[PDB]
């Protein structure tokens, strides 16, 4: 639920960089699963969507 895939791509400057594909939601942050574990389940429930405003 954090990243749905990853790739390693060599940029024009010759350096290899990692690109991660974030999990997405259909226009609904409420439906978006905000987590910090490689888990599909929606474990974390946040009362404050924007903790730091």
């Amino acid at each position: 639920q954090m990243f749905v895939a990853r790739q390693v791509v060599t940029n024009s400057k010759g350096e290899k960089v990692e690109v991660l594909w974030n999990a997405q939601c259909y226009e609904d942050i409420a439906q978006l699963n905000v987590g910090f574990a490689p888990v599909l389940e929606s474990v974390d429930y946040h009362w404050e969507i924007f903790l730091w405003a």
Binding site: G35, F36, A37, P38, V39, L40, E41, V43, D44, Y45, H46, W47, E48, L51, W52, A53
Partner: protein, 206 residues
């Protein structure tokens, strides 16, 4: 350490099979534990047999493994959560700290009140009608016909109706069939409805 709280030692603790492998007390808040990964050797062999002519995969012969229960939702720790949410009034600056652990996470708690939640329509309607006796105290009571000539003749009119039915005009009307047959008999001081009248007998006068 207390063995009374240890399921392995204390046999009086009823294990919940539906929560096997999930320990809410071990959650991180935010949860940062990985419990799912690539799994093979169940139906798809982990080794390589694409070009093995002498080996053919039979997925039907799937060996049974340990049941994987769905993840249990986090359970609240009352003291820890209360301490975390507690803030000192005139001793704490009004601000939000950088650390994300200060986020207020929702943790499921006691489930008893949800029984009343589920039964609320029954409870609410009972309070509305039975408890408040709405619209009146007689609507929900088992129906009883009035006693003979009770409360007054002008309202009951049992004797006059009986005489009319027993009279020539009453018999002629019954023969016509527009008027249904009499439904009660005046016994020795009491009125008794016939079993086919589909009503209870009048309540006793005491």
């Amino acid at each position: 350490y207390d063995w009374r709280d240890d399921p392995k030692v204390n046999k009086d603790i009823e294990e919940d099979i539906r929560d096997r492998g999930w320990h809410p007390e071990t959650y991180d808040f935010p949860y940062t534990k990985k419990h799912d990964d690539w799994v093979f050797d169940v139906t798809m062999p982990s080794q390589n047999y694409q070009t093995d002519l002498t080996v053919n995969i039979h997925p039907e012969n799937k060996k049974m493994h340990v049941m994987k229960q769905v993840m249990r939702q986090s359970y609240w720790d009352a003291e820890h959560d209360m301490a975390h949410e507690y803030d000192y009034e005139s001793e704490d600056l009004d601000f939000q700290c950088e650390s994300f652990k200060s986020q207020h996470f929702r943790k499921k708690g006691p489930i008893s009140q949800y029984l009343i939640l589920g039964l609320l329509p029954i409870l609410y309607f009972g309070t509305e009608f039975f408890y408040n006796h709405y619209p009146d105290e007689d609507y929900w009571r088992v129906a009883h016909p009035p006693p003979l000539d009770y409360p007054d003749t002008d309202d009951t009119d049992d004797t006059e109706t009986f005489k009319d039915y027993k009279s020539f005009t009453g018999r002629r009307m019954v023969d016509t069939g527009i008027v249904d047959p009499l439904w009660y008999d005046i016994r020795e001081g009491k009125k008794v409805y016939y079993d086919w009248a589909g009503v209870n007998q009048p309540m006793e006068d005491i």
